[PDB]
Amino acid sequence: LRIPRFSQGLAQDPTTRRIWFGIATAHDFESHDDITEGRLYQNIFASHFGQLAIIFLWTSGNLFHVAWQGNFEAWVQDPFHVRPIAHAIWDPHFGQPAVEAFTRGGALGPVNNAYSGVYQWWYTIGLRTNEDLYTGAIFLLFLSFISLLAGWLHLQPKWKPSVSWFKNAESRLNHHLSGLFGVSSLAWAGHLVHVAIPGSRGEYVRWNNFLDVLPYPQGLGPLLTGQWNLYAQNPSSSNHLFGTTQGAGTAILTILGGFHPQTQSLWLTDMAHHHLAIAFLFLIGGLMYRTNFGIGHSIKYILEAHIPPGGRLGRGHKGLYDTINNSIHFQLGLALASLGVITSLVAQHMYSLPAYAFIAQDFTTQAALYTHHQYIAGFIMTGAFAHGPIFFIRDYNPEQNADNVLARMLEHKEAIISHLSWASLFLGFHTLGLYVHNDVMLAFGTPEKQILIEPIFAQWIQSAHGKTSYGFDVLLSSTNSPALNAGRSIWLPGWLNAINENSNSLFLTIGPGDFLVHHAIALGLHTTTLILVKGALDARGSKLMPDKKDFGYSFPCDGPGRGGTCDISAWDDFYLAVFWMLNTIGWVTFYWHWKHITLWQGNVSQFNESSTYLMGWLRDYLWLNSSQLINGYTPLVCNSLSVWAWMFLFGHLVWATGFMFLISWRGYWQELIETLAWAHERTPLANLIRWRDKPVALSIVQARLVGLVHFSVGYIFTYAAFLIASTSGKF
Amino acid sequence: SHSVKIYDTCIGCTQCVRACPTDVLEMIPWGGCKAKQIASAPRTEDCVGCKRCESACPTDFLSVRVYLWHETTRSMGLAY
Amino acid sequence: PIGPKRGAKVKILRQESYWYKGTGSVVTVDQDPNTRYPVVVRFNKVNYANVSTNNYALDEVEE
Amino acid sequence: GHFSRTIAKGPDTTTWIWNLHADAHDFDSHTSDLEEISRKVFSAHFGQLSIIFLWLSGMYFHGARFSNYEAWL
Amino acid sequence: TPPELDPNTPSPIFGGSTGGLLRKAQVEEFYVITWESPKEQIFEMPTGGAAIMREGPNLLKLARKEQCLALGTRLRSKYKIKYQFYRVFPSGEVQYLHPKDGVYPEKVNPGRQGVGVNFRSIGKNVSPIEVKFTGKQ
Amino acid sequence: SGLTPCKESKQFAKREKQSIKKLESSLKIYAADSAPALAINATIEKTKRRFDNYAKQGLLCGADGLPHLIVSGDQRHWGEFITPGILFLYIAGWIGWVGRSYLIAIRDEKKPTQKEIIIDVPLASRLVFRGFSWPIAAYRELLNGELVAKDV
Amino acid sequence: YFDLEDIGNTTGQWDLYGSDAPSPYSPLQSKFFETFAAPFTKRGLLLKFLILGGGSTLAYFSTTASGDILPIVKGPQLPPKL
Amino acid sequence: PSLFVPLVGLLFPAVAMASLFLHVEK
Ligand code: CLA
Ligand code: CLA
Ligand code: CLA
Ligand code: CLA
Ligand code: CLA
Ligand code: CLA
Ligand SMILES: CC1=C(/C=C/C(C)=C/C=C/C(C)=C\C=C\C=C(C)\C=C\C=C(C)\C=C\C2=C(C)CCCC2(C)C)C(C)(C)CCC1
């Protein structure tokens, strides 16, 4: 009859509630009318092609604007002293001083300074001209199309796959490991040795000459013969100019380690070697499980056989195979969990080990990328912990999982939750305690009475890596051991050079200030996990509500009876954790940024002393770096940072607006609207017009969402405005 | 509209009915308990879903359960 | 006259009861076969609704 | 709840403690006797006046012994 | 039981308010309530204040059904008064609800029909299941 | 431990002098023989004393010129954490054991909650000192330090 | 006092408030307007005409001398590190 | 060129919001 068509019960709502909820439930296929397992699987599979189409289109546009409105070529010729251009600006509201200030990077008009690091990435892989960027944009536009073509193709009956096909896991793993991971990594190693590395050295190897240009002097033979060391005889000289055939070796596969001294980035030869190396593990690994040829494993049976006799895990993992394969919420929560972990692994390894040329010197880009991925990694983790409860409520079969490791979690759930409470309470009581204590004496003017615990455990790890600072005498920095000498030159000499670099971010110096914050982050992790698992383990029910299983993942509440039951659903527990997640990542990004902007200014001394007490954070970090930001537009002038000053205030406004939906609740607003409904009816010249949807206050759950969205958007945008401007201003 | 159910664990104290302001429930002759009565939910159409009935139930966990389902003007409690 | 004494302590087996694995004293036990749940039980601790008693099914252990 | 007998009764949950203070001055919920209430609040005003009076005494006292008022003059 | 029916009766004294019926009554539904008073008393009247009860049949038209019961439940208390209300609709029609059976819902009656009674007991409900229904059937 | 002990520190030593000069700056406006005078001078000796003591007991002091505690377990610096830590757990357990011992004694007979809001039972018969030997609760553990109602 | 199941309208606020006026008309000048306002009375056809009337906005911006789209000229700042 | 497109990026909301409105009230 009406929108939403997928929900008839929703479509018959006379109020404005239907339009809202029609949007918020469009992707929840399992709740749609007359849903079948068949319809469920190839809706996702088709929605999957839709997502790919967006990514390729989004990436196509990036290659387009940089080629059309970005200099790039000007950037290539002097990567150190030119600012990359994202795209042009066209805004009628712009005053002349605006068009003025934003004209940068040698552009004919006002543009935006790119902080995505696409310039360094594209330059490192071998893109040298705008023409190259266009061909990529066209190719991605074409890739974006065939994704839609495949999406449309499998929605057709003559090409649609069976659910069982989707549930054949043994073969999907075998291909994804061997093909999706292995081959793609192998193919990339080819681009590196054919284009990236030779493009780095100085030769332009492209489609019209790649067929006639050897990647290596010696033939393809040495690989096939067996002697592969010949691919490492002649590496690039330390004093090598990128994009210049100066001090350029011939080797296409090395393990030098450390950084290319001019670019401060990892060697391309190391990477061409890396991907080639990992491709194999993936390639062999993608041949573990059984398919149609008579050899291979059975995942189920391996899970079945893993039962420790004599307790204490019970039935082990029996029936666990079918619980996962029949539940795509388990799979997603399992996927987000793994993806979320390596998302941070990207953030941690990309600032410590820069992969692209001239990215380490672009301090605004480095800060942005780390902060970017940590918040991305943050939200992903809350999703892995969100599809968890949904699995328990919608897809969990208690009987089929009788006394296995999964079912043993629900029967001692009070143990996991209470100790998470203890660990959270422990960390909080002392981390906050040590902080406040330190502020007291500095107020009292006696900073020599502070509790400054030296992170001696972590410093012991640093010395174990090769850092000759401190007197620890541990592996890779000791007097006699099998570890360092296993270096056998190769990685160690180039890498040990890199670790004792006082300039790079590769293993910075840490102290008492680094101790307190790491505990704050540990507090943030534990508490967030406490909230999320408690929502998961009590998703099917508690003692306050034993039949929570019968109400679904998201419901408003259970009423004011039995003392009150506000925010008792597993959905709300997620919604509460999102707050704690933002706080945690907030502390992480604060800690990363401040320690770096003090390092970049050549003044780590200020961080080492001000980070030990909380007033230092608010003043020497928050207050101190805001001056240039908040003067983006002044009652006297107008700078290029005016965008960020405005967005800074914008973020504050969205943030505070969420507070309205989180503090004030529905019954007040509904009664207010009822008076407004009366008004409109009794007002002449306005009676002629009537609404087609009954005006009602937002729902209890909707408001918690809407408020959280405001809270999260303002949270991000405010810090984004500050992270960029404060860093861009000083550089 | 809203979905309400009654369970045999009831003891016929009739408090769920007295609590309801829209008259959704009523008492029914039954042989299951000493009162020999039991709650009934005939008029779910007039149910607003406020769970006043649940806060009057003395049974260890509720014998009457309200499951908020599809919304209607009556359930939305609108006077306009 | 049926399963549980008048003063006997009894462990609850409902799973949905506030006192799910707890113990409690029985008030009495009606003898009408019609009655689904007799075996009234007193408890020392109240639940989220401030009631101290509840009637249970015949299936429970004693102690 | 000291004020009311059933209220005082016994404690079974911690909610009793919070309620005790929340309705400590809620005199019209302890009795329906208007005279009893009025008598209660009238005396309560005296107890108030005593506290602010004591408050004033400390302000004058501190001004005498622990202040540099003479020096400021 | 035979519904008594209501034809015409005088309305209680009041003088007007802004909480009365509005459009919904014209196009969807409106509810009327009738009660007899042994004295011209004064009652609160929801959605407003102070109205004289009147003595006689007493007929009042309201909306939401609930407004009628609130008044009715206050009408049964304070004053020992019997009452009944119906749902008028927009095109005549006679739907009589409450008491209905003629004896109050709280008082057990001989022939009512259970409607939505589960003899399973709570906690013995199942878990889905992609099939229709939720398990609390 | 890139830190060099508070004795051979030039920063931590400099920090001492900086603090006392500021205090000395204040007594110049009050004229000795006056009250605010001693209070300032009494503060100065405490300043000198605490700086003097910290150098004695060890304490490594970073480049910032402030003492950093070492909690690795190093025997040279046990007094910085382990010995105070052992003292804490002692009192922490003692409190824990005395409190537990109380709620246990209360439970049989009486109205148990009556004793919780009002304890006109002081240390019961004599429960406090029982904490002097709390660690013997290890022997309570081998018997029934825990109830067997839920799990093991 | 006055409820009549017969007429459900007066019972409700069905009645047009006296602001209704079903009186005569206005001068014959209408004969003119009815002639020239006809093409816009069709609906849907007008919906389109106005949207394609958005072709005006394109025309007005493609050609516009006095909107800030020029620096006007300056020598740009380097500026924090060039 | 680039002064023709951001407005059709604003004609489009006018068109989209209108169409969607018709879709949701149907
Ligand atoms: C692989 C990634 C992935 C996939 C495929 C899914 C898929 C699903 N999720 Mg999940 N989720 C994920 C990740 C994912 N999620 C992550 C990472 C989190 C952590 C936050 C969550 C948290 C989450 C919750 C809490 C819920 C789901 C739910 C669902 C289901 C229905 C969602 C829906 O249609 O509602 C519609 C979605 C919208 C209408 C989104 C619009 C609102 C957001 C705020 C817009 C983005 C913010 C804002 C607009 C930005 C504008 C700012 C501007 C100023 C620039 C569906 C199976 C729901 C469910 O399972 O039903 C029971 C459910 O309640 N997810
Ligand atoms: C009220 C004042 C105002 C207004 C109206 C604008 C308007 C605009 N600005 Mg300006 N800006 C302002 C103040 C303002 N700005 C101030 C004070 C500063 C600091 C001095 C700037 C600095 C600035 C810069 C640097 C740039 C702009 C740009 C733009 C243009 C955006 C391009 C676009 O439309 O693409 C599309 C529009 C969007 C993508 C917005 C989508 C976000 C929505 C809310 C979320 C998604 C909605 C969702 C899909 C729901 C669907 C519903 C929908 C289909 C109806 C637009 C003309 C950019 C530009 O010139 O374009 C080339 C540009 O780069 N502005
Ligand atoms: C060689 C055989 C092969 C290959 C190449 C693929 C490939 C793919 N499948 Mg298919 N599949 C296969 C066989 C294969 N499958 C078989 C035999 C079956 C069952 C009989 C299936 C059933 C199946 C289903 C049901 C689905 C897929 C899907 C997908 C897509 C996954 C989504 C994605 O693009 O991210 C790919 C990820 C990578 C390429 C990298 C791996 C992730 C790492 C961790 C990222 C980090 C890499 C690096 C460090 C970072 C570089 C960043 C830098 C470049 C900027 C992908 C295109 C999904 C889909 O439809 O697409 C949206 C999906 O729904 N497959
Ligand atoms: C449970 C609380 C807790 C948590 C979650 C962490 C977590 C962390 N610590 Mg901290 N640590 C703790 C307690 C904790 N620590 C305590 C009580 C001390 C002594 C003051 C330390 C001293 C310490 C140092 C020196 C360092 C860390 C570091 C770290 C990080 C790396 C992992 C590690 O080595 O720690 C190991 C944690 C343990 C070995 C203790 C586990 C928790 C026990 C069970 C708490 C109770 C022990 C009890 C008090 C012992 C009695 C002492 C004595 C009387 C016998 C990680 C964030 C490193 C870092 O990255 O610095 C920035 C680092 O170098 N920790
Ligand atoms: C900063 C966040 C914030 C904002 C903006 C508001 C705003 C408002 N509150 Mg609220 N409130 C808040 C936080 C906030 N509150 C919090 C944290 C609480 C907890 C106590 C409350 C509790 C509360 C109560 C109890 C009430 C309000 C009410 C109101 C409204 C008063 C009427 C009004 O001024 O309208 C004007 C709107 C503004 C001034 C907001 C800014 C308008 C912008 C600048 C103009 C429009 C921009 C543009 C055209 C949008 C188009 C862009 C396009 C792309 C969409 C107003 C909407 C009252 C109300 O309902 O109205 C009487 C009311 O009763 N608030
Ligand atoms: C003319 C002065 C006056 C008087 C005589 C009363 C009297 C009364 N009020 Mg009222 N009230 C007043 C002003 C007054 N009020 C003002 C100005 C407000 C607006 C804020 C209120 C808001 C209010 C509410 C919401 C309620 C009352 C209620 C009551 C009744 C009993 C509640 C009670 O016992 O208190 C109980 C005392 C406490 C619970 C102590 C709470 C702790 C306080 C608030 C912390 C204060 C912080 C402190 C100042 C600074 C920090 C110190 C700390 C760090 C150590 C009683 C008749 C209650 C009632 O139901 O009426 C019958 C009721 O719920 N009042
Ligand atoms: C040595 C040391 C260290 C380490 C530590 C550690 C690492 C450890 C541990 C630990 C652990 C891992 C432990 C565990 C456990 C467990 C359990 C299982 C428990 C229990 C308990 C109980 C049962 C108690 C009870 C009680 C008492 C007895 C008292 C009072 C309270 C109550 C009453 C509560 C560091 C180096 C840090 C520092 C230096 C020293």
Ligand SMILES: CC1=C(C/C=C(\C)CCC[C@H](C)CCC[C@H](C)CCCC(C)C)C(=O)c2ccccc2C1=O
């Ligand atoms: C203000 C407020 C309302 C009233 C809010 C209403 C009526 C929402 C209506 C918002 C109007 C329509 C303007 C919003 C415009 C948005 C930008 C929507 C954009 C359109 C799409 C992106 C969805 C509640 O209903 C409520 C309920 C529960 C707790 C707190 C609150 C609460 O704080």
Ligand code: SF4
């Ligand atoms: S939720 Fe409200 S309307 Fe529904 S049965 Fe309970 S008391 Fe009646």
Ligand code: SF4
């Ligand atoms: S409250 Fe429970 S026991 Fe009492 S009448 Fe209602 S359903 Fe029966």
